Amino acid sequence: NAAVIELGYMGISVKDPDAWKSFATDMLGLQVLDEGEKDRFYLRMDYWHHRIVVHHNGQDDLEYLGWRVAGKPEFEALGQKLIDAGYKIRICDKVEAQERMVLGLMKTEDPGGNPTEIFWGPRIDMSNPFHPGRPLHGKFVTGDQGLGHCIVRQTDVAEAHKFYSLLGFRGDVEYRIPLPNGMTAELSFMHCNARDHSIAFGAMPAAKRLNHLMLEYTHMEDLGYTHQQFVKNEIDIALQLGIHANDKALTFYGATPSGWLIEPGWRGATAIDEAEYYVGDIFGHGVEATGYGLDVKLS
Amino acid sequence: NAAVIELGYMGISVKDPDAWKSFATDMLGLQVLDEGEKDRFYLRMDYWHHRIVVHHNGQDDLEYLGWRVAGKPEFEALGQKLIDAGYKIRICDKVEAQERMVLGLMKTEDPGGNPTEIFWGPRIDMSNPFHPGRPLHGKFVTGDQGLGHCIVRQTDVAEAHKFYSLLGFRGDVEYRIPLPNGMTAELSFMHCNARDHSIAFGAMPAAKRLNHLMLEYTHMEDLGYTHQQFVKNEIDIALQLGIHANDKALTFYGATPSGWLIEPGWRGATAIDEAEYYVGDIFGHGVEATGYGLDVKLS
Amino acid sequence: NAAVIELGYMGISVKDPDAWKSFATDMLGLQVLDEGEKDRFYLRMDYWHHRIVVHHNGQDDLEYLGWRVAGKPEFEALGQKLIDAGYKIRICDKVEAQERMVLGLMKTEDPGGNPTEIFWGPRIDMSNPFHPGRPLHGKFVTGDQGLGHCIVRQTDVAEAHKFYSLLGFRGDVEYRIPLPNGMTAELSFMHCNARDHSIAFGAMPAAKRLNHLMLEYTHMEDLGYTHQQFVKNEIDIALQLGIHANDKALTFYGATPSGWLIEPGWRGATAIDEAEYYVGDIFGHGVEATGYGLDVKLS
Amino acid sequence: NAAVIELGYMGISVKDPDAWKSFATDMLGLQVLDEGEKDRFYLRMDYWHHRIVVHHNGQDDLEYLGWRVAGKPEFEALGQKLIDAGYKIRICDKVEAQERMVLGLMKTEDPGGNPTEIFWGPRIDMSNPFHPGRPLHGKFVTGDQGLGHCIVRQTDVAEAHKFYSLLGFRGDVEYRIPLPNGMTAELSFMHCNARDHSIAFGAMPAAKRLNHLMLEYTHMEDLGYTHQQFVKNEIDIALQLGIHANDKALTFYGATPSGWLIEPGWRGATAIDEAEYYVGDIFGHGVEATGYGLDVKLS
Amino acid sequence: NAAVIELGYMGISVKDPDAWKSFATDMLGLQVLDEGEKDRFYLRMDYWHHRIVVHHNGQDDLEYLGWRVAGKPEFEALGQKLIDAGYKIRICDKVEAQERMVLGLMKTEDPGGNPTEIFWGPRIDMSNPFHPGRPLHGKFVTGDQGLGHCIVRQTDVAEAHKFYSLLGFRGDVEYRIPLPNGMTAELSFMHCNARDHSIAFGAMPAAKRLNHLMLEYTHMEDLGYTHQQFVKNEIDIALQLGIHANDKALTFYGATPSGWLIEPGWRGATAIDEAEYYVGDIFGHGVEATGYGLDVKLS
Amino acid sequence: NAAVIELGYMGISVKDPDAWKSFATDMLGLQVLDEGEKDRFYLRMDYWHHRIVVHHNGQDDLEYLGWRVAGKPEFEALGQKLIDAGYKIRICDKVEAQERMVLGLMKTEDPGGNPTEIFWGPRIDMSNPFHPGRPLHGKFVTGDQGLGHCIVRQTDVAEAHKFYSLLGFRGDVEYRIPLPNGMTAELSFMHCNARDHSIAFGAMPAAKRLNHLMLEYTHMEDLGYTHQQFVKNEIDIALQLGIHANDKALTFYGATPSGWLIEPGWRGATAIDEAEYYVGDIFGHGVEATGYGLDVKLS
Ligand SMILES: [Fe+2]
Ligand SMILES: [Fe+2]
Ligand SMILES: [Fe+2]
Ligand SMILES: [Fe+2]
Ligand SMILES: [Fe+2]
Ligand SMILES: [Fe+2]
Ligand SMILES: [Mg+2]
Ligand SMILES: [Mg+2]
Ligand SMILES: [Mg+2]
Ligand SMILES: [Mg+2]
Ligand SMILES: [Mg+2]
Ligand SMILES: [Mg+2]
The missing domain is CATH 3.10.180.10 (2,3-Dihydroxybiphenyl 1,2-Dioxygenase, domain 1)
Structure with a gap:
């Protein structure tokens, strides 16, 4: 349909x-x-x-x-x-x-x-x-996978899921992250094509609509050179290089001039319809700069 | 659906x-x-x-x-x-x-x-x-094929088939084994993915819920070394190395400490939706140790 | 040349x-x-x-x-x-x-x-x-690999190597097997095409010129059925099913009517020009019947 | 030959x-x-x-x-x-x-x-x-590429080249690195198989025979987890993650307990017989800890 | 060379x-x-x-x-x-x-x-x-295989072999055909590229230099239609459809207006450097019209 | 060598x-x-x-x-x-x-x-x-094929061939072009890698060392857009779009500011060691602007 x-x-x-x-x-x-x-x-x-x-x-x-x-x-x-x-x-x-x-x-x-x-x-x-x-050594991954993915603010995850499900997206909670206060942060991730996800959200408070935008390079060399550009120009890196357990891409998170985060990445995995969840990253994504809504321990 | x-x-x-x-x-x-x-x-x-x-x-x-x-x-x-x-x-x-x-x-x-x-x-x-x-030389075959397969006890095969069919499984009687008493033992095998079968059963009496569990190695060398470990440790082998006509894997059946059987194997065939039946194995699976519910002549 | x-x-x-x-x-x-x-x-x-x-x-x-x-x-x-x-x-x-x-x-x-x-x-x-x-389920592996391989008697390994090297064969000692008497049995293996070896020998005494002949099936099912034929007919099996570390084939060794051994096998590896050696098999080849010149512990 | x-x-x-x-x-x-x-x-x-x-x-x-x-x-x-x-x-x-x-x-x-x-x-x-x-997610890259590569101390590059050339290696100066003092550091890299290089050297003074050893993982996830282990355990990282222009691997350089460096890496390129040279890395390898013989600006 | x-x-x-x-x-x-x-x-x-x-x-x-x-x-x-x-x-x-x-x-x-x-x-x-x-459904097989092959008259096979060997051809006697008179007809076949052979000859008397020329179609449909054209036009077919044991092509032999034979064919095998010989065809090539130098029983 | x-x-x-x-x-x-x-x-x-x-x-x-x-x-x-x-x-x-x-x-x-x-x-x-x-839609074809090819002036073709042959090039006369005066223009083409040719020459008089330089795009779309740029900017096109019989590329020839010609192209064929010759192009390359040393009828 x-x-x-x-x-x-x-x-x-x-x-x-x-x-x-x-x-x-x-x-x-x-x-x-x-x-x-x-x-x-x-x-x-x-x-x-x-x-x-x-x-x-x-x-x-x-x-x-x-x-x-x-x-x-x-x-x-x-x-x-x-x-x-x-x-x-x-x-x-x-x-x-x-x-x-x-x-x-x-x-x-x-x-x-x-x-x-x-x-x-x-x-x-x-x-x-x-x-x-x-x-650039390469170009961007777009085509049937669209421009990238974002995390955006939601106030009610069940309601957001209902809406995006009606639009044809699939997916559910994929991360249950332990927090020092004893709570758990749950994030849901939804796909509409082969990109692991196109939209994601949880119920965390947020000053902005947009938490981050991920853009994917075809070549690792371009991701690495971009990372170097952030370091050389002393731009805040909120999360260091690492790989999330769901999308399996090599990525880092850095400040844009607008204060929300860009997540340059490389080698994202194909979306799967079978739901599963994780309690941590494969490696990296350690916190460096804080104040960007991602002060969580992913290991 | x-x-x-x-x-x-x-x-x-x-x-x-x-x-x-x-x-x-x-x-x-x-x-x-x-x-x-x-x-x-x-x-x-x-x-x-x-x-x-x-x-x-x-x-x-x-x-x-x-x-x-x-x-x-x-x-x-x-x-x-x-x-x-x-x-x-x-x-x-x-x-x-x-x-x-x-x-x-x-x-x-x-x-x-x-x-x-x-x-x-x-x-x-x-x-x-x-x-x-x-x-290990390799690892296990899991992924879209799940953990393995089991034979479990049933009292009414038609009723069991009805239940598993509702859950989405497919399959029917695949083995009609001649017995010395003149009877025939019928076993049914059902799949829900590419593993030849995930659940199987007949109407034979059984002291335990579980007859056997099959786990599949990616490498023949690991199956062989496992077989050697059973022989060296003098663990009961109920059925010797052989290949069943349906799943086409190289396997043997050995005692666990709990008394039911483990079936280590290698090279299982892809499930097929077209029903057929067999009256014997391709080779092997000769009876060695008895008392495990599998005292049948598979040749 | x-x-x-x-x-x-x-x-x-x-x-x-x-x-x-x-x-x-x-x-x-x-x-x-x-x-x-x-x-x-x-x-x-x-x-x-x-x-x-x-x-x-x-x-x-x-x-x-x-x-x-x-x-x-x-x-x-x-x-x-x-x-x-x-x-x-x-x-x-x-x-x-x-x-x-x-x-x-x-x-x-x-x-x-x-x-x-x-x-x-x-x-x-x-x-x-x-x-x-x-x-047969399949056929034999011949073609560019010739009919099979043999171990034959030699009295001086260095002299044998010189001869076969002149004929264009390559290879050297690949097995150093510990013996209970404290000695070591050394066997050399030589190839002239993609079959792991075509001729092999050591300095062990032997009543016959021929120790064994290996013939290779294309299908595992034929090897298994052959093994079953030896068991059912109560023909001496000198070495049980196993895999040698060099040729990597699944094989067993059984008596011929002439008293020397046939080694039916499956899945032999491609010959390599780079010499290496091993001190045991990957698995199996346990001694069963003795008196055939292969009473060695390969594990 | x-x-x-x-x-x-x-x-x-x-x-x-x-x-x-x-x-x-x-x-x-x-x-x-x-x-x-x-x-x-x-x-x-x-x-x-x-x-x-x-x-x-x-x-x-x-x-x-x-x-x-x-x-x-x-x-x-x-x-x-x-x-x-x-x-x-x-x-x-x-x-x-x-x-x-x-x-x-x-x-x-x-x-x-x-x-x-x-x-x-x-x-x-x-x-x-x-x-x-x-x-580990994967294993190591060895096989026809051997265990890895090293840089070792030399006092006369021409003499070292003569020796390794006689042994069958190929290669020459691949890096000409500008130094603040106005000089240039020249490093030569030689291969004997598909690994980009197996031995490399220049004429820089060195307290140890061994400058570094590179070991290559099959999976990026293992390289990343290793990097994390160095960070979490506060082990000196001499050069941060980056990619050299010749071998094209993702690597970093970290202290061993012996004081010389290990270079864990991933995705090394195939050796080429055609000589060329570079004046900088593709990205990264920024200096962090000093005192390890690699205080050079690779960018 | x-x-x-x-x-x-x-x-x-x-x-x-x-x-x-x-x-x-x-x-x-x-x-x-x-x-x-x-x-x-x-x-x-x-x-x-x-x-x-x-x-x-x-x-x-x-x-x-x-x-x-x-x-x-x-x-x-x-x-x-x-x-x-x-x-x-x-x-x-x-x-x-x-x-x-x-x-x-x-x-x-x-x-x-x-x-x-x-x-x-x-x-x-x-x-x-x-x-x-x-x-035509297709075209001809030429390219690196040249135009086709011929059998030509020779008076001394050893001398002919010496000459063509000097030119770079390889091959020897491949057919030993029993003759009713008790003799054997020996034919030699030589290749200079991937076509099974390009020149062939024996010591049989012959009124013409040329015994036959073989031309190879890419498509079986064209060979079949050509065969039909010979039958419909009542042109002598000397040898009926069949497959020789060396070149393994489907072919027949028919009269040209000049009296020597054309051999249209399809699906010729790749030349091999390893000499072997045969004593008959795979099938067919039965004699129909005689008087063309090919009155031999190939079966 | x-x-x-x-x-x-x-x-x-x-x-x-x-x-x-x-x-x-x-x-x-x-x-x-x-x-x-x-x-x-x-x-x-x-x-x-x-x-x-x-x-x-x-x-x-x-x-x-x-x-x-x-x-x-x-x-x-x-x-x-x-x-x-x-x-x-x-x-x-x-x-x-x-x-x-x-x-x-x-x-x-x-x-x-x-x-x-x-x-x-x-x-x-x-x-x-x-x-x-x-x-650009794509990039250039370089790598093992080098930057492109040129035709340069020679006074003695045999001498030029001797020189380039010593350097390791291969090739000879590939074009014999009929001229209205009744003569024939012969051009020789030599390769040193997979590019159809890297250097070519004949004995025609020439005011410049360089007749043309050919540069090859990976994408047809870039060749076409380049052609359009020449037309829109009213730059002399000496030879219109066409395909030569040897290199088989789609190309045209246009004036550079220096007066010699650039030949942008796409889809060049792999060099062959087997010499042959042609007497015309596959299509096109009609003369438009004259005075550039290529006033020849290629058809
Ligand atoms: Fe993201
Ligand atoms: Fe089973
Ligand atoms: Fe053997
Ligand atoms: Fe290195
Ligand atoms: Fe023929
Ligand atoms: Fe050109
Ligand atoms: Mg998902
Ligand atoms: Mg089934
Ligand atoms: Mg060997
Ligand atoms: Mg190199
Ligand atoms: Mg031949
Ligand atoms: Mg050429």
Whole structure:
């Protein structure tokens, strides 16, 4: 049946666009595309016109997540499914769709208050191959796996699960992390394609909608050089290099100019439909800088 | 639809835990994990926290079989299917689920009286790779094929088949073995994944719930060394090395300290949905020690 | 340069041809070919007219080993190499070559007194496919690996090595086996193609030229059924099922009607040019019947 | 022609054997084998009886490197080659060969004074599979690539190159590293098989024969866990995680109890015969702890 | 060293060119190329300008075989080899080379009197793809295997073998065929590339230089349709469909308008350097029409 | 033996460096590297520090071709080979080698007067991945095939062939092109690795040393976009898109700012050692702009 198939794009808003352009290009290798618009620019990772929209005059947080469906029949079926289950949606007119550069667009909000968009028909600029903002050994892993994954704030995990399950995602609690206070932190991870997960969440308080965004390189050499760029430029590393037990990627977590975290990574594992859980990482991800919502002992 | 996907774990109870630890490690290569609990320890075969729970103060028999489903949606669908067909089940609370180290758990009994558990979300310790209790050339075959297979006692084969069929298993009578008394022994074999079978049974009387447990090595060299360990230690071999016509594995059957049989093996064939039957083994499995419920001529 | 490329054929002489025909067909699956000759018959394993010649009125021992070279240029080069190094050879005339069914033939004796023949151009009966003397799951491993391997008697290992090295073989001591008397038994193993070895020897006394002949099945099921045939017919098994550390095949050693041993096997490893040695088997090969020159503890 | 084919074994001497046993097992995953000898024990990495001999009462440095040749013909040819070129060698008697557990042994010293042994016929314990001293996800990369690589002290690079070239190695200067004093450090790297290099050296002063030993894991997860073990145990890391431009492995450099460095690594590239050079690493290998002969800026 | 690498071209002379054009196109699928020359036309099988030259006003027999060498260095080395061994050759001038459309050409005669040419640098018309003279399912097997194979007349097999061996061919007697008169017919087969053989011969009397030419289709369907064309047109079939024991191709032998035989075939086996012989075909090749030099019982 | 293995680098001199930087980046996608030197800059195509050196104040022509050998042993052997055959060479000192950024360098001139350099040990900047001067779908084909190929001026083809043959190249006349005046233009093509050819030449008069340089893209899309860039910018196209019969690449020929031609291409075929020749292209390469030394009808 009709389901979301990838995380297609995301919009963020920032207080310092100039800092973001330098950060995205030099530290990460993303491509900056400026179409001369007064209030925004774009970041590219592949042939798509863009994967991230960076709005100016902002709040240093997530503005929207854009989830792709295969085509108009799936768009319409999913819209009606959401309406029938009691969710509030709005089908956008052509001007709004053109703003996002998509053929069809609807807007809603997830149960945690995160603005959520569902669309079909992204604009692909095959004439304009990706050209990274610094030299790269490789490129990014996108394609059928979409742009990456995020953890976002939720207030009720069961409600969030219900919503994303309706959209076609699968998954549940995969981490039960012991905390010094004696409690346990539970995090749930959900997939909609071969990427281990595309969205994840728990019930931890959070000042921002977005906890982190993970972007995946094809080559280990690019991940390593990115890590070095963070160290040389003295950018906060919240979690050191390590490998989580679910996605099995080599990754670290570092500060963006907006204060939420980017997780550059390499060698993510294929999603599995069979639920299991873990109580720690395979190695690493030790805490270094704190204050980023990830002061947990993963070992 | 919703179905059992593997034999996930099993619990046994023993009169002599010390003998079992030495047996499991030296004779078989399993890993002993002791979490300091007064009444039990664990045996590992792979990344799962455990595959076998060994309870003390016991009856030298099977305590429960734990069957895995993919996730919560399948768990709930299967529970309702069992209720609708007239079977008695109990959904366990968090304390009971935590005892088994699973995210969701229900308890029932099969038609032969064997305690049967259905669960989702096993605990996987990716941080703690399998470390066998003796040096091994290889490891065990688990993964999508679960821990192994068992033959268990039944009083009514048709009723047992009905139950396991509802759980999603497939299979029927595969062996019709001539007996000297002129009768025929019929054994049925059922699969839920690529392992040739996970559960099997006939209508033969049996003092114990468990007839045998089969564990599969990846390497022939480990099977051979295990066989040698049984011979050198003068442990009863009930059936000598041979190959059954259905699962096509090289195996032998030897006594455990509890009196039921372990069947170490190598090179099991992929399960097939097309039913057929056989009247003898390919070779071997000659009777040596008797008194173990397998005094049959397989040739 | 010119070298021997395989063990092509062998001739044996027997006191009881009728017993040998039944043994070869029923116990091993070889094909008997009788061309109506008063004093001999043939055993086939593949498309070659034959691999073993069985002479009547015999001594229950090896008569000759026939080693193949690629063609006439290699035959002539090797002959001259042997002459130059001081060995005595005789190039056979057409009648003698026709007896062996080869295009070119020379006769000599190895340093241990074993009659040795070098030939080119075997007769292949492509019109007459192998038809085993009992039903087989598979066939034999021959082709570029020749018929099998043998251990034969030698009185001076260094001299034997010199001879076989000149013929193009490679290898050296691979087993140093501790003996109860405190000594060590050293055995050397030499290859001329991908079969782990084709000829092997040590300095142990021996009543016969031939210690054993190894024949390799393509299928484990045929090895197992052969083993069962020996057990059911109460034929002496000198060494039980096991795996040697060099050739890595699953094999056992059983009595032939002539008193020397046959070693049926399966899954032999590829020969390696890098010399190493071992002090025991991987598993098995325990002594059962004694008196066959292999009363050694291989573990 | 005759050439060295791998780094087969090495001998070291230590002041604190107990510390070394704990280090090798817990920090690296090597297997300790103690044969009850008063003055030494062994470390295993694979089926070889051992790869490293650890002598007691020592100097906390390298004692010998053992280089393998394929067999006796290569051993003898290489010996004569060394003699003809003016080097001093000694062919060892059986007692000395048995000490090293090899079939043939010769002793010499390289131009830098490093004791060098050439041997054929290592002892392989196929009956005794590797069993790591801590749980491992994988195993080590050995086989045709030998045990690993080392950098050792030399006083004259041209002379060292001449010697190793005669032994069959290939390679030359691959790194020209700028130094603050305005000079350049040149390091040469030589291979004898598919491992990027087995021996390397420059003309830098050094208090010890051995600068570092590199051991390669099959799995990234084991490298990462080893790195974590060094951090958690507060063991000096001389060079942080990084990738050199020649061997292309992910590696770090850490202190051993003897004061020279171990370089655990993963994913080494295949050796190439075409010489090239580099002036920096791909990423990482930043200096952390100093005093280990590697205070160079690799970037 | 320098060797012939393929049968590149052949020249024939015919009494009836019109009949030959119809035969080659309709019966075989060859392509006729007429360059407007008064005395000859060409037959193509692939991208080469031609593979067969058909001269008018002829003798209904072979005129020359053209054997290719890789380049000028091999041409010159082979010429000198022939001169040194006592053979008479002539290096052709540019006009003669241009006649054959080659870069270098020499002319000689084999020991049986067959005009033999050795050349390098054939003309390839990549602009002019093969276009068969009738519709074909597939194409011909040429490439590294050259145009096909022939049997030609010889008066002294040993002398012929000496000559072709000098040119770089390998092979010897492969068939010993019993004849009713009690004799044996011996035929020798020699290869210079992966085609089972390119030239073959025995000592049988023959009115023509050429006994047969074999051409190989890529598709069985084309062989079958060709066979049908011979039957429907009532063209003599000398040997019915069958498979020879050496080349293992499905083939039949049919009359050409010139009276010698064409052997269309499919699925020829790869040449082997190891000599063996056979005394019959695998099946078929029964005699039908006689008078073509192949009245032998192959079974 | 010792041979050249690739076209490693080339040096050109130009009158207009600014025009060349824009041309190389925008029209071709090469990377400009400027090290701040007053008289030159570099063009990159891969990890090598550079492949082309662009000298200022120049003659708008080739300055030198740099041919790579595997290492110092090959360098020294080739030098002595050249000296023994009567050619004049000079082994360069360290300053001259450092200028070219190589470990060893010698200078000579080919028989046509083209400055020729032979070197070992290029500088590879693995830390600095290729970053094209415009967005590219793919990258360039270099690696074991070197930078590309060139046609250069010669006055005596036989002499040129002798020289390049000594260096280890293979090949001969591959094109015989009919000319309206009734003559034939012969061009010879020589390879030293898998690239169809690396150097080619005939005896046509030429105002410049360099006729053309061919650079090969991995992706057809980049070739096509480059072609479009030439059309849109109204740059002379001397030969339109087409495919030559030898190298089988899709290519066109366009003017550089220096007046000699660049041949961007895609899908070149593997070099073959077997000489053949052609009299036309497969398609295309029609003449458009004239005056570039390629006014020939290739069809
Ligand atoms: Fe993440
Ligand atoms: Fe079983
Ligand atoms: Fe054997
Ligand atoms: Fe290293
Ligand atoms: Fe033929
Ligand atoms: Fe070109
Ligand atoms: Mg998941
Ligand atoms: Mg079944
Ligand atoms: Mg061997
Ligand atoms: Mg190297
Ligand atoms: Mg042949
Ligand atoms: Mg060429």
